[PDB]
Design a protein around this ligand. Structure first.
Ligand SMILES: [Cl-]
Ligand SMILES: [Cl-]
Length: 162
């Protein structure tokens, strides 16, 4: 298992514009297009992202290409973030995947807001961090995905995904 396969399980793949769990216009492998309510503002962003007139539909390749950029951006955002970097550096390879996952879903800013959990992860207090992470809108809104991520942090294995 690796970050790509992990995120592909959590986000799925859709080749036509869809709405995410929060109601936003998305496409491919969890690629957020816009927070705007307009399907037209969504199609525009999409065409801008792909470099062609897409009429709201893309190919598998196009999806995977967006996905590669997004994982890359996720990692680079963590490494450029003063709050995130130290956490990431302190973690083992599996747990690093767990943090990238959170970043991919919620953005650097949001994750960076989990101050207390971050401090617990850095200290390697797994059980305590898992408990703190669960007290969040995140866990309440997407409980199955949150539990999988949380279990990855607690355990340091890919069990939740196997
Ligand atoms: Cl983009
Ligand atoms: Cl969920």
């Amino acid at each position: 298992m690796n970050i790509f396969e992990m995120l592909r399980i959590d986000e799925g793949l859709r080749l036509k514009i869809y709405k995410d769990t929060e109601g936003y216009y998305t496409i491919g492998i969890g690629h957020l297009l816009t927070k705007s309510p307009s399907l037209n503002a969504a199609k525009s962003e999409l065409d801008k992202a792909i470099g062609r007139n897409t009429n709201g539909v893309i190919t598998k390749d196009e999806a995977e290409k967006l996905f590669n950029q997004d994982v890359d951006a996720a990692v680079r955002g963590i490494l450029r973030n003063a709050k995130l970097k130290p956490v990431y550096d302190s973690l083992d390879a599996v747990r690093r995947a767990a943090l990238i996952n959170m970043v991919f879903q919620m953005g650097e800013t949001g994750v960076a807001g989990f101050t207390n959990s971050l401090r617990m992860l850095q200290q390697k207090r797994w059980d305590e961090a898992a408990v703190n992470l669960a007290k969040s809108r995140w866990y309440n809104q997407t409980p199955n995905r949150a539990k999988r991520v949380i279990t990855t942090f607690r355990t340091g294995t890919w069990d939740a995904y196997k």
